[PDB]
Design a protein around this ligand. Sequence first.
Ligand SMILES: CCOP(=O)(COc1ccc(C[C@H](NC(=O)O[C@H]2CO[C@H]3OCC[C@H]32)[C@H](O)CN(C[C@@H](C)CC)S(=O)(=O)c2ccc3c(c2)OCO3)cc1)OCC
Lengths: 99, 99
Amino acid sequence: PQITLWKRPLVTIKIGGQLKEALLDTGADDTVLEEMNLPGRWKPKMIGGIGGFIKVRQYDQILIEICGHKAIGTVLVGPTPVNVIGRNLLTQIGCTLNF
Amino acid sequence: PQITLWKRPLVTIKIGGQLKEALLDTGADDTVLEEMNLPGRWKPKMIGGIGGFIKVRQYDQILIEICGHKAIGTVLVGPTPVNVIGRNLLTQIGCTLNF
Ligand SMILES: CCOP(=O)(COc1ccc(C[C@H](NC(=O)O[C@H]2CO[C@H]3OCC[C@H]32)[C@H](O)CN(C[C@@H](C)CC)S(=O)(=O)c2ccc3c(c2)OCO3)cc1)OCC
């Protein structure tokens, strides 16, 4: 599909057996999701943007489905104000910018 | 052009007659550039990112060319970690997400 950018590019994702809403974010290197108690091990990480850094938990080899497109990769979990799908997963679903 | 996302979608922009590098950022509502000198009036504003809020200078109706495509819109100047082109200008140049 084609998503215009008049409004926030919000889509439904499936992760850890749950459905959530997330932004398709070409400015995000990594994927950052709201607090959720995913199973398994993790590693601490800090990520920075406008306003500074937040602390997140890095989970690897996580399965996510985005608009029926499956992907598997690293997900960062923490007190982010918004769920963002970053380039690590956008590439896997074949997402491009076009103008 | 069609831009894949294996690397950051960085492009050259021209603003205030000066060339800069900026990130096409579908997760940003607004366009935020690092500290620079711009001609014209401005108003102080606050914007919030992943780590908190920052103070910026709001310049309205600014000419800015993005990868060969002209826009005229609002540009925020302040302590952003990187120059980001937000949806307010991505829409002007006809940019969409596609997968
Ligand atoms: C519920 C209240 O929300 P809120 O206002 C904040 O909400 C939002 C916060 C963040 C975003 C996404 C963020 N957009 C953003 O900053 O846009 C600004 C300007 O336009 C406005 O529109 C939305 C906010 C304003 C970028 O797309 C992506 N970022 C990096 C980018 C700056 C390049 C360095 S990143 O998120 O930091 C990030 C993601 C993955 C990573 C990483 C860093 O490093 C490793 O992987 C969207 C909405 O609370 C205030 C505390």
